[PDB]
PDB file of N, CA and C in Angstrom:
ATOM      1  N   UNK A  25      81.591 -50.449  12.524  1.00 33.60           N
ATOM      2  CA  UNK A  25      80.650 -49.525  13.214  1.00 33.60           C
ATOM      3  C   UNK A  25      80.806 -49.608  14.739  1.00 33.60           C
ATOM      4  N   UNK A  26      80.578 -47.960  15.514  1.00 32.86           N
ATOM      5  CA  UNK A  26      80.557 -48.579  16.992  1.00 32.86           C
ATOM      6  C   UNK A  26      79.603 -48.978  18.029  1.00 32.86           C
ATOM      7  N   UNK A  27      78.675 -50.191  17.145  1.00 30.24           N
ATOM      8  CA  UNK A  27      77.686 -50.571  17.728  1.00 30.24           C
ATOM      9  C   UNK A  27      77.617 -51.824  17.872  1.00 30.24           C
ATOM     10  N   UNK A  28      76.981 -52.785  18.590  1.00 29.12           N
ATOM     11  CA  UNK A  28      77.042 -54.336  18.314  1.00 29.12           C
ATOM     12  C   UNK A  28      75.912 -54.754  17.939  1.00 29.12           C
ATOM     13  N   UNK A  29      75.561 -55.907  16.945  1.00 33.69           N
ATOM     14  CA  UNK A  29      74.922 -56.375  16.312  1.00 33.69           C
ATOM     15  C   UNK A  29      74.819 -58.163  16.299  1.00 33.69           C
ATOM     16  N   UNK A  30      73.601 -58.689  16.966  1.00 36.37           N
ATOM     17  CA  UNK A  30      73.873 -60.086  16.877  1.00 36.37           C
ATOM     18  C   UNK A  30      72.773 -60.386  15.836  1.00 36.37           C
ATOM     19  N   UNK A  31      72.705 -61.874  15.692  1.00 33.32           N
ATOM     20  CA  UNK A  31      71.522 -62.380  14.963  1.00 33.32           C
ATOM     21  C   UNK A  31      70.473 -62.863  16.188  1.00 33.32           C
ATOM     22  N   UNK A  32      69.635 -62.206  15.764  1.00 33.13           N
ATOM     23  CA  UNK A  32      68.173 -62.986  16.811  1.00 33.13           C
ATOM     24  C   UNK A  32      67.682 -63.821  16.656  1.00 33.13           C
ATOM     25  N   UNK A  33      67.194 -65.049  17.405  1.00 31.92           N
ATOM     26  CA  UNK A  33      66.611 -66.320  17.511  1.00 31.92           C
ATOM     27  C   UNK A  33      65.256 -66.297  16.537  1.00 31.92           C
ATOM     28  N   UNK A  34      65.132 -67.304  16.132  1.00 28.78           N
ATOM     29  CA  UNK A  34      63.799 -67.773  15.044  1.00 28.78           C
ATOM     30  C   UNK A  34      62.518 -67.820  16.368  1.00 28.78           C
ATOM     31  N   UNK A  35      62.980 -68.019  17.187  1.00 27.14           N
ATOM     32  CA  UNK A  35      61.633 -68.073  18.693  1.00 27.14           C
ATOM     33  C   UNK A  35      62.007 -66.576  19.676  1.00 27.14           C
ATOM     34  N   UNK A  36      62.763 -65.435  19.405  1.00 29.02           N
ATOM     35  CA  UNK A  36      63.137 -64.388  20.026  1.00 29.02           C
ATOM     36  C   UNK A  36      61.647 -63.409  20.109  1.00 29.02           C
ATOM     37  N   UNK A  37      60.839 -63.410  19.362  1.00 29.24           N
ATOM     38  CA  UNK A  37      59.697 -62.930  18.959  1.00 29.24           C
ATOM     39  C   UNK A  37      60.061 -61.213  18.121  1.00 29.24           C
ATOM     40  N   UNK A  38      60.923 -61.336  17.163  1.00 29.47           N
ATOM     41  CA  UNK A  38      61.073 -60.273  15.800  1.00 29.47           C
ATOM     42  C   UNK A  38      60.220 -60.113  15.335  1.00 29.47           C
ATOM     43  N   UNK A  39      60.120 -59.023  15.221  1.00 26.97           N
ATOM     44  CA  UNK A  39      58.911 -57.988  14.521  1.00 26.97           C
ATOM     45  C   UNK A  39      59.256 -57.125  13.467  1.00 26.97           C
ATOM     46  N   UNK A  40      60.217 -56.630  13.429  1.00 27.58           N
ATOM     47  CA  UNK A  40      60.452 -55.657  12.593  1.00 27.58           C
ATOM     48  C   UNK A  40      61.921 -54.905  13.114  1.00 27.58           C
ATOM     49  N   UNK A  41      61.910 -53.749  12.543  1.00 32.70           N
ATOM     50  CA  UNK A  41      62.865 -52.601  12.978  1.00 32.70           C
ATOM     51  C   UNK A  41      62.098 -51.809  14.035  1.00 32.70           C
ATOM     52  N   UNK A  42      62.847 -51.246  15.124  1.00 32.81           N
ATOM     53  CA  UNK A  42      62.704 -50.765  16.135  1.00 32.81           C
ATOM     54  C   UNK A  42      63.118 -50.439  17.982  1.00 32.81           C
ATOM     55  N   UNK A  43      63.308 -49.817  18.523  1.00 30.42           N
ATOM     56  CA  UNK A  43      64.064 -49.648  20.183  1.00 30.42           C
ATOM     57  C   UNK A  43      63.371 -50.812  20.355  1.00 30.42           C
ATOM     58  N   UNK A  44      64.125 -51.762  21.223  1.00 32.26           N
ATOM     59  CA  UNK A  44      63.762 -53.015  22.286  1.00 32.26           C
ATOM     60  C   UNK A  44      64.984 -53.626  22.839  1.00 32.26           C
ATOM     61  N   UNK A  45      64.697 -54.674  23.949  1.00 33.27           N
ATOM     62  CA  UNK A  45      65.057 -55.105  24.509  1.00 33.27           C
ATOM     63  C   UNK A  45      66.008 -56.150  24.333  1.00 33.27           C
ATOM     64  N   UNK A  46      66.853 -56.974  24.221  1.00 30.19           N
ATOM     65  CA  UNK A  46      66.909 -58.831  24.078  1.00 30.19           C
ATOM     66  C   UNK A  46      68.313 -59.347  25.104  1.00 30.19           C
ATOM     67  N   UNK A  47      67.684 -60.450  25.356  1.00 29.84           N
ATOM     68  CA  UNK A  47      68.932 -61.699  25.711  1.00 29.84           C
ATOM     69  C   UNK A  47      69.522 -62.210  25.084  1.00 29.84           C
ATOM     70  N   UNK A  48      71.158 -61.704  25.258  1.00 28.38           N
ATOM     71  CA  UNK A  48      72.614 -62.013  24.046  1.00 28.38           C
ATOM     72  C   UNK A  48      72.762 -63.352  25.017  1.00 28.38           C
ATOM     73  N   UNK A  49      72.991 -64.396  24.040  1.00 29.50           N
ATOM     74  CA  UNK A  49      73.347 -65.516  24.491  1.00 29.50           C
ATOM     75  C   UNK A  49      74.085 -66.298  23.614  1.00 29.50           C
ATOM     76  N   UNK A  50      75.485 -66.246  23.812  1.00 29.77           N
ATOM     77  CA  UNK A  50      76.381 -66.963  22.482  1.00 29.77           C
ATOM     78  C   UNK A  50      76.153 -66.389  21.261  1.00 29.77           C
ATOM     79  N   UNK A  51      76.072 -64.720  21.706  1.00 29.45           N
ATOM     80  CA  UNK A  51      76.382 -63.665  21.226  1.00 29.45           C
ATOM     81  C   UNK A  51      74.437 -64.188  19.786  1.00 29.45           C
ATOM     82  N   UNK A  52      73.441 -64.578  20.420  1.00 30.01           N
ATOM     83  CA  UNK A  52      72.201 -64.850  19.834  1.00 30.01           C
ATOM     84  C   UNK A  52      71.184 -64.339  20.657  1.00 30.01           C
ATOM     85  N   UNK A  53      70.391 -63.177  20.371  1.00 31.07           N
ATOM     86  CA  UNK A  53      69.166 -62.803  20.974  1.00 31.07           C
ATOM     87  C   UNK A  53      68.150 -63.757  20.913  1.00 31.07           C
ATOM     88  N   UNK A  54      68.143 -64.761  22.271  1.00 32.17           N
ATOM     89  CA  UNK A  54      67.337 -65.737  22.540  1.00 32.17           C
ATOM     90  C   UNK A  54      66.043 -65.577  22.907  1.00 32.17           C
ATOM     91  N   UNK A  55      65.815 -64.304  23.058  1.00 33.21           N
ATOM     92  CA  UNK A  55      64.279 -63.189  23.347  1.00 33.21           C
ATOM     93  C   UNK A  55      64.579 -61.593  22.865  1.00 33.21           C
ATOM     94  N   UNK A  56      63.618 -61.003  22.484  1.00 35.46           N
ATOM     95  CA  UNK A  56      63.371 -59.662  22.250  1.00 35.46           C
ATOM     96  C   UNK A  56      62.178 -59.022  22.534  1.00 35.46           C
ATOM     97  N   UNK A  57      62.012 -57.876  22.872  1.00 36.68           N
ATOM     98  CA  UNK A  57      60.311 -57.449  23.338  1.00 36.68           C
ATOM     99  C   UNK A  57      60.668 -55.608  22.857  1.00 36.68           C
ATOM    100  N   UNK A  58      59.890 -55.217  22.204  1.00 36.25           N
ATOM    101  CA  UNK A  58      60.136 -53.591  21.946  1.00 36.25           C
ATOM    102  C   UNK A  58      59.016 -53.267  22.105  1.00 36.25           C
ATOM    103  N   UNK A  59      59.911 -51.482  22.488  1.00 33.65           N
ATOM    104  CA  UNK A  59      59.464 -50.145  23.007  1.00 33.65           C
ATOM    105  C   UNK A  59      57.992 -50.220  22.873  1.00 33.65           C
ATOM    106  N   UNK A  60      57.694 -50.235  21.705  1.00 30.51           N
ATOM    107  CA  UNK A  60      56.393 -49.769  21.358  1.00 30.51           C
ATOM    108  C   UNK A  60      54.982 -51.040  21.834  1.00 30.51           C
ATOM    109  N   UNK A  61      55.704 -52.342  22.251  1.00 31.83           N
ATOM    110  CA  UNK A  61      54.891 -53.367  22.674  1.00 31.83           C
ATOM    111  C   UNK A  61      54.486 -53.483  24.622  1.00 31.83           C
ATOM    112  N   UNK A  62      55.641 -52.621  25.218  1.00 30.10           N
ATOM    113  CA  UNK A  62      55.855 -52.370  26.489  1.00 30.10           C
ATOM    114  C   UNK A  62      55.162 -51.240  26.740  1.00 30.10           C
ATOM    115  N   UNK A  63      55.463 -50.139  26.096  1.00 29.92           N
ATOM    116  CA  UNK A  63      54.869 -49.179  25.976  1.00 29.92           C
ATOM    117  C   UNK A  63      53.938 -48.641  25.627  1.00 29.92           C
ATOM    118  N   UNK A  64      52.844 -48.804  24.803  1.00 30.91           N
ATOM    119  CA  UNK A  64      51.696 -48.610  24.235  1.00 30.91           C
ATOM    120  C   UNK A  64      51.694 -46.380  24.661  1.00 30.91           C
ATOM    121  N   UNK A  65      51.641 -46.430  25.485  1.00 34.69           N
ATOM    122  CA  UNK A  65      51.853 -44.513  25.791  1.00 34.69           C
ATOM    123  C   UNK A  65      52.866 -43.826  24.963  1.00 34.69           C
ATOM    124  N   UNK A  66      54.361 -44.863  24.574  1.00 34.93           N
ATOM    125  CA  UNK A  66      55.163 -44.146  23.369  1.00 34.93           C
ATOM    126  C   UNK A  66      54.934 -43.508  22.482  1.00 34.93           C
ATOM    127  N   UNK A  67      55.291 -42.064  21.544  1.00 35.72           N
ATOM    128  CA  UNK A  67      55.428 -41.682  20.550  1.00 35.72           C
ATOM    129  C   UNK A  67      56.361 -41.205  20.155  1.00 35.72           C
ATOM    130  N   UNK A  68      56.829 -41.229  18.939  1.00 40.35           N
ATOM    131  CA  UNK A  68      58.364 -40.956  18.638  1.00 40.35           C
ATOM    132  C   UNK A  68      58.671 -41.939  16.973  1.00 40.35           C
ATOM    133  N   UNK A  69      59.907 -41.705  17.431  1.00 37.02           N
ATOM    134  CA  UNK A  69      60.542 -42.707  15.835  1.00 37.02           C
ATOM    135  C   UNK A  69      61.925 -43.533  16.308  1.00 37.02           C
ATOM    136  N   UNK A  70      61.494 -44.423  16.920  1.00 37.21           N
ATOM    137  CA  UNK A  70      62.975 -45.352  17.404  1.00 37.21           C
ATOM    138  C   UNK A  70      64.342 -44.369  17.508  1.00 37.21           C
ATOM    139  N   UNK A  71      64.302 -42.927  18.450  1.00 39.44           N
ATOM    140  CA  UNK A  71      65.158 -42.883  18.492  1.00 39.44           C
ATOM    141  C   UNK A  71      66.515 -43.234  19.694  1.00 39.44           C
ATOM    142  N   UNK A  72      67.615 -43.327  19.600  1.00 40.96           N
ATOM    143  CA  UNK A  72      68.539 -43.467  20.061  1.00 40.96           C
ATOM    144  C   UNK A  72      68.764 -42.938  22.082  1.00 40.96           C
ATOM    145  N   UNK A  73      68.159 -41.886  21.554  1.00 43.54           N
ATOM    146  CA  UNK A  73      68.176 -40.499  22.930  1.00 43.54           C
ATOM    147  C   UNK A  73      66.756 -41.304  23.704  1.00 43.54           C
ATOM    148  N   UNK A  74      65.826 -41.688  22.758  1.00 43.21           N
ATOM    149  CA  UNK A  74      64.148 -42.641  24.008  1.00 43.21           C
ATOM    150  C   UNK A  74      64.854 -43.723  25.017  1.00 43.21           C
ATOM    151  N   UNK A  75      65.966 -44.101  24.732  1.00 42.05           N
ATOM    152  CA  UNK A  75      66.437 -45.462  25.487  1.00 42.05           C
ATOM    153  C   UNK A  75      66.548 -44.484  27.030  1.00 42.05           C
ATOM    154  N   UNK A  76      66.825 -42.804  26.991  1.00 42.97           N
ATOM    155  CA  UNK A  76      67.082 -42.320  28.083  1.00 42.97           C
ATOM    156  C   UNK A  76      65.920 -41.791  28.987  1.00 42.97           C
ATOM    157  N   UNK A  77      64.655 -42.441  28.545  1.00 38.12           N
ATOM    158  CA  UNK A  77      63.256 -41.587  28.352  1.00 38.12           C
ATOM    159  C   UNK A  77      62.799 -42.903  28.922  1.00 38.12           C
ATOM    160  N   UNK A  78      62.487 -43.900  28.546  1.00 36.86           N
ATOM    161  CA  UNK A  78      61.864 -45.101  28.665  1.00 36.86           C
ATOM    162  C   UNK A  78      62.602 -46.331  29.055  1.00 36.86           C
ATOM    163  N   UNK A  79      64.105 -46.260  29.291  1.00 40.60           N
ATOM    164  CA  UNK A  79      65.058 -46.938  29.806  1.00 40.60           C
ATOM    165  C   UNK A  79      64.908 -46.863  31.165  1.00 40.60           C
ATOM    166  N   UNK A  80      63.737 -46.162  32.270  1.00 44.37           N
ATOM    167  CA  UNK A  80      63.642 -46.134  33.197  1.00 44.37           C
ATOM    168  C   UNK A  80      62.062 -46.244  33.271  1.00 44.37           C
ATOM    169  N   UNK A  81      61.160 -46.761  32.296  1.00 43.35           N
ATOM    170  CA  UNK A  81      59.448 -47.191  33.007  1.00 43.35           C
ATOM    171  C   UNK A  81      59.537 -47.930  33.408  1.00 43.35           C
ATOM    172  N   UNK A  82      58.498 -48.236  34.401  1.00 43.78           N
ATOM    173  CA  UNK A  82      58.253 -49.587  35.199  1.00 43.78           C
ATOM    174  C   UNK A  82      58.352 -50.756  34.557  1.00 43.78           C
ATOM    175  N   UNK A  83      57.181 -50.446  33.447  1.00 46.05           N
ATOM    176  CA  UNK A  83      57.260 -51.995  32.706  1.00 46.05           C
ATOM    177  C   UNK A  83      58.231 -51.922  31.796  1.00 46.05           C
ATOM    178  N   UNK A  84      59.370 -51.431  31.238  1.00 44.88           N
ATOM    179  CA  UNK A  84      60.511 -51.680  30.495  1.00 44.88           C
ATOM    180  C   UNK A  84      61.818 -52.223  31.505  1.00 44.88           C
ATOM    181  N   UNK A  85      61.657 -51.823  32.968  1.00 44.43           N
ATOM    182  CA  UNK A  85      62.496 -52.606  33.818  1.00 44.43           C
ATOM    183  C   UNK A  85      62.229 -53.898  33.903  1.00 44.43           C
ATOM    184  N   UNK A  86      60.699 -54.049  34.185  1.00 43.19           N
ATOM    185  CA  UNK A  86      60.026 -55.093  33.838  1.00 43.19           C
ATOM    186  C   UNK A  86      60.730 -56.226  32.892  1.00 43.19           C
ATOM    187  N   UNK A  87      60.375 -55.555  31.767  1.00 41.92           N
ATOM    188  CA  UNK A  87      60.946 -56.313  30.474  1.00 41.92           C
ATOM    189  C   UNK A  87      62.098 -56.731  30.314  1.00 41.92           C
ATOM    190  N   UNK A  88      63.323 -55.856  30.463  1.00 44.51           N
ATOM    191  CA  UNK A  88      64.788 -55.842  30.790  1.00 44.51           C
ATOM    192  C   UNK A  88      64.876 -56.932  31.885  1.00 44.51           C
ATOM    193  N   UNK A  89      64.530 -57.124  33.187  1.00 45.50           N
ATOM    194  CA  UNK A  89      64.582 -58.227  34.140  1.00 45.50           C
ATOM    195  C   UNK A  89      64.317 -59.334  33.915  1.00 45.50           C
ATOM    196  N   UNK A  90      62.727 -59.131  32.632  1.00 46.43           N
ATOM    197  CA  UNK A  90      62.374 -60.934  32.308  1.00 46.43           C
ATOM    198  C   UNK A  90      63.436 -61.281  31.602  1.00 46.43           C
ATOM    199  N   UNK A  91      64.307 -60.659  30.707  1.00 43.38           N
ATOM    200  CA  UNK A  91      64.968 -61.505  30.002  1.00 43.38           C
ATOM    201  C   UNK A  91      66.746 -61.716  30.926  1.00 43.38           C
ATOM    202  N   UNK A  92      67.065 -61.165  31.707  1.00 42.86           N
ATOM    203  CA  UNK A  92      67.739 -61.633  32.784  1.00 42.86           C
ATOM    204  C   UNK A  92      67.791 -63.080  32.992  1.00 42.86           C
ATOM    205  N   UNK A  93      66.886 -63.842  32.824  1.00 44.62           N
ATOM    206  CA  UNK A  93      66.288 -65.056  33.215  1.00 44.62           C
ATOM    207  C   UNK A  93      67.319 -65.717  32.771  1.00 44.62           C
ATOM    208  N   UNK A  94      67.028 -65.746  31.405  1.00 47.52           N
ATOM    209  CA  UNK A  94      68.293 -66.296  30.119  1.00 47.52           C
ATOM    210  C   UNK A  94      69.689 -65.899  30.463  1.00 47.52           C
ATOM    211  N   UNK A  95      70.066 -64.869  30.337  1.00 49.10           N
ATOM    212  CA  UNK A  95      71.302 -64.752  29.610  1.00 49.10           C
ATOM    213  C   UNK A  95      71.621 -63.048  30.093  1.00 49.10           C
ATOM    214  N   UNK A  96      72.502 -62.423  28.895  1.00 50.01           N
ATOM    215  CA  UNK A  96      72.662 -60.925  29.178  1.00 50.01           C
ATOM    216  C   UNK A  96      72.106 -60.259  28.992  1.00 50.01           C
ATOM    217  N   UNK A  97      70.738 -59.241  28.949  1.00 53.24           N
ATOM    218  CA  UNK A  97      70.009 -58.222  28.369  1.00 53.24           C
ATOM    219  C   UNK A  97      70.782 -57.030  28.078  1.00 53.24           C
ATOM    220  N   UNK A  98      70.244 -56.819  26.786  1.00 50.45           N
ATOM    221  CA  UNK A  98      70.984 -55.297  26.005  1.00 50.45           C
ATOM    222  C   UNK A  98      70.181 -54.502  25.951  1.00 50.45           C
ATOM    223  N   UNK A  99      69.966 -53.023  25.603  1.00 52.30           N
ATOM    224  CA  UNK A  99      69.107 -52.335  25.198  1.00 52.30           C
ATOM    225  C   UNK A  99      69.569 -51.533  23.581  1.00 52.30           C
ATOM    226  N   UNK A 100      68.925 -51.503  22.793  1.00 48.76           N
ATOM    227  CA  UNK A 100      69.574 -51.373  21.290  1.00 48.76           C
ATOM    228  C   UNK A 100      68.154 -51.064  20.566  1.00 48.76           C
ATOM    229  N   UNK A 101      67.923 -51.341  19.437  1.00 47.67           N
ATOM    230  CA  UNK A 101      67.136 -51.655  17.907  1.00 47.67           C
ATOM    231  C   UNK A 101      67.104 -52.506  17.595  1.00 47.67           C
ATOM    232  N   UNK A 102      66.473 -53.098  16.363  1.00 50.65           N
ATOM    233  CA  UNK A 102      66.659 -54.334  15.801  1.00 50.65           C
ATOM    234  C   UNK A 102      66.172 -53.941  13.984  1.00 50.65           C
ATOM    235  N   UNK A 103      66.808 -54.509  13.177  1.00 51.27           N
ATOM    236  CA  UNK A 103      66.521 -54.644  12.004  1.00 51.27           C
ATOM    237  C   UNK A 103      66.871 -56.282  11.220  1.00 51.27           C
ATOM    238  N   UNK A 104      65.970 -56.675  10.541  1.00 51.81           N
ATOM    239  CA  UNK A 104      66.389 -58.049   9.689  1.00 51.81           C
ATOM    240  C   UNK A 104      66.802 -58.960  10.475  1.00 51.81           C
ATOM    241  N   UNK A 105      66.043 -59.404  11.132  1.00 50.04           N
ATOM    242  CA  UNK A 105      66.742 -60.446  12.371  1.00 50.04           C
ATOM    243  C   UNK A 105      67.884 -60.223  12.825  1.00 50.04           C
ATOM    244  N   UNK A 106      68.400 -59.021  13.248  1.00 51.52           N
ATOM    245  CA  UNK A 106      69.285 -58.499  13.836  1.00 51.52           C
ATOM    246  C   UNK A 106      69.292 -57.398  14.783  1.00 51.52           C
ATOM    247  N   UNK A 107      69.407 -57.580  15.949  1.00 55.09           N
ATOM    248  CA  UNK A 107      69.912 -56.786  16.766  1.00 55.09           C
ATOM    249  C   UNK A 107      70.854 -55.666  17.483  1.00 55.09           C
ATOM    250  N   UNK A 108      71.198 -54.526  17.305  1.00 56.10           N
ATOM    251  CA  UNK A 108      72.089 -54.100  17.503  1.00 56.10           C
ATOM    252  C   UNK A 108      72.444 -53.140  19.086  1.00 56.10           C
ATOM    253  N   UNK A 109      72.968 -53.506  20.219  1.00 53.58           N
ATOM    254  CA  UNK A 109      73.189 -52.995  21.720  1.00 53.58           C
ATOM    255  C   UNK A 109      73.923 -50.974  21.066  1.00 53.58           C
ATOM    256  N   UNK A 110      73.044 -50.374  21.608  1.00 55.13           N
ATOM    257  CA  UNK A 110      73.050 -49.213  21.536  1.00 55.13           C
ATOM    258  C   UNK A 110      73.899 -48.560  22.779  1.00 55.13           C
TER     259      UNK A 110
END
């Protein structure tokens, strides 16, 4: 597939399927935070095209910067303790 997909950390804070954030670190999302937890004003259905919509709010730069801290931040989905950079 032409997407990337890591496994996310047991302490990354996974929730489910959905647009978010995380820090790839030895190719392991060592944090994650999504759309809909940053956002609370969102409506929609995790799509692909919102990363171009909400890839620029305050508090999703926000979010994207805290995890800077760590490691590399991606912007993607996540399903099954997995992550995938969109």
């Amino acid at each position: 597939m032409a997407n990337k997909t890591y496994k996310i950390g047991k302490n990354a804070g996974y929730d489910g399927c959905g647009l978010c954030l995380a820090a790839i670190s030895e190719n392991e999302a060592i944090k994650v935070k999504y759309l809909r937890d940053i956002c609370p004003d969102y409506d929609g259905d995790d799509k692909a095209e919102d990363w171009l919509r909400w890839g620029t709010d305050s508090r999703v730069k926000a979010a994207a910067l805290e995890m800077e801290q760590y490691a590399y931040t991606s912007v993607g989905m996540a399903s099954c303790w997995e992550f995938v950079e969109l």
